[PDB]
From a paper:
The Rab11 subfamily plays important roles in specific trafficking events such as exocytosis, endosomal recycling, and cytokinesis. SH3BP5 and SH3BP5-like (SH3BP5L) proteins have recently been found to serve as guanine nucleotide exchange factors (GEF) for Rab11. SH3BP5 exhibits a V-shaped structure comprising two coiled coils. The coiled coil composed of α1, and α4 is solely responsible for the Rab11a binding and GEF activity.
To elucidate the GEF mechanism of SH3BP5, we also determined the crystal structure of SH3BP5 in the complex with Rab11a at 3.8 Å resolution. Wild-type SH3BP5 (10–276) was used for crystallization of the complex because SH3BP5-RA tended to crystallize in the apo form. The asymmetric unit contains four complexes, where SH3BP5 interacts with Rab11a in a similar manner. The electron density corresponding to the N- and C-terminal regions of SH3BP5 (residues 10–41 and 268–276, respectively) and the N-terminal four residues of Rab11a were invisible, suggesting the structural disorder of these regions. In the SH3BP5–Rab11a complex, both switch regions (switch I and switch II) of Rab11a interact with the coiled coil comprising α1 and α4 of SH3BP5. As compared with the GTP- or GDP-bound Rab11a structures, the switch I region is pulled out by SH3BP5 so as to facilitate the release of the bound guanine nucleotide and Mg2+ (21). The switch II region adopts a helical structure, which is also observed in the inactive, GDP-bound state of Rab11a. In summary, SH3BP5 opens the guanine nucleotide-binding pocket by capturing both switch regions. On the other hand, the P loop region, which binds to β- and γ-phosphate groups, does not contact SH3BP5 and remains folded as in the GDP- and GTP-bound structures. SH3BP5 interacts with the N-terminal region, interswitch, switch I, and switch II of Rab11a in the SH3BP5–Rab11a complex.
Author numbering:
A (entry chain E): 4 to 173
B (entry chain A): 42 to 265
Write the structure that this text describes.
Amino acid sequence: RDDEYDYLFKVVLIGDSGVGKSNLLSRFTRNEFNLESKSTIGVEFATRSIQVDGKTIKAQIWDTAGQERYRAITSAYYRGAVGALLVYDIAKHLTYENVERWLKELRDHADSNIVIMLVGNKSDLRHLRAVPTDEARAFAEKNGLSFIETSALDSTNVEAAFQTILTEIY
Amino acid sequence: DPRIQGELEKLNQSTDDINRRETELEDARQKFRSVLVEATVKLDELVKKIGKAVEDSKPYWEARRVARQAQLEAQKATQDFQRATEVLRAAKETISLAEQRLLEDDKRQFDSAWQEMLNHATQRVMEAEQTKTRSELVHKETAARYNAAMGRMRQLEKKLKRAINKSKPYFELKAKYYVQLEQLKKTVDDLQAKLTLAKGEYKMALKNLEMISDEIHERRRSSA
């Protein structure tokens, strides 16, 4: 009797594959599928319900749809979205250039009134930061978006940001 | 595989369908609380005004709701008796017409077709008189409770004449807020039912996707 909630916000995980969006919300969120659905469905589901303003809010996290197939149904993927998380790798400068394309992907299909958070995660455990934090944090505030740069070890900053995004909606 | 787009888009609509109902539920319930607290404070201020007649008239109004209740009983039993009386009228008419054909042709009493038209006709009247007498006693008993409840009410009207007059605006306002809360109760109970059907439709539109995901995994194990 812990699946009870009041509201249901919908946020999505977008960006390039391999950045580790799936493994970032491993300890926080709860994947509702016991087996990988990216290889089949293309999209994976996970959720984490918290209490905001006296009400239990269960946010629904839709994982990366993937480039290879099922791009036509990404229109329904982006629809009804409340928030979005851009996760690029700080070691790979290419992932920082593609998030500019995923942003324009939201402006075409996803809802206009969405709150997006740009996340720079250190997945590549062997390389330095090709993307400067200064220029990364500056670019995020130029598009009216939030920003946070985290690592695989300290999962403290991540969970605190997930509690903030949901509160702003209500 | 092509079933996915139909599920996600409906999962999408169901998500909004949940939030739109819980919000209305949160609103309807809030307006329900606002009235019950309003009904609570406005009833007490009438108790602090003239409370001498309020508690003394309660036996009357409680003896009046009984009279009304015993009235609907005597009213339903009358309709059920009136209906049960028309059963015999259509039954005894059939068993009377059969006797008429017996006087016309006396040799008809050996005809197997006429014996069957009597057998079923004389069977209905057996079951008709049974349901009649049962409905007849109920008609009289429910009428007795009515006349008794009319006595209980009228007698209490004599004793508490001055009482019910000073307490009349209390019970009148009490019922006005009753129906209002009753309506607000219905608008909450059904919205929480619609909310459940919204969450349920959302919970089932996820499990099928897990089935689809697990269905492909089994096909990826064997041959194409």
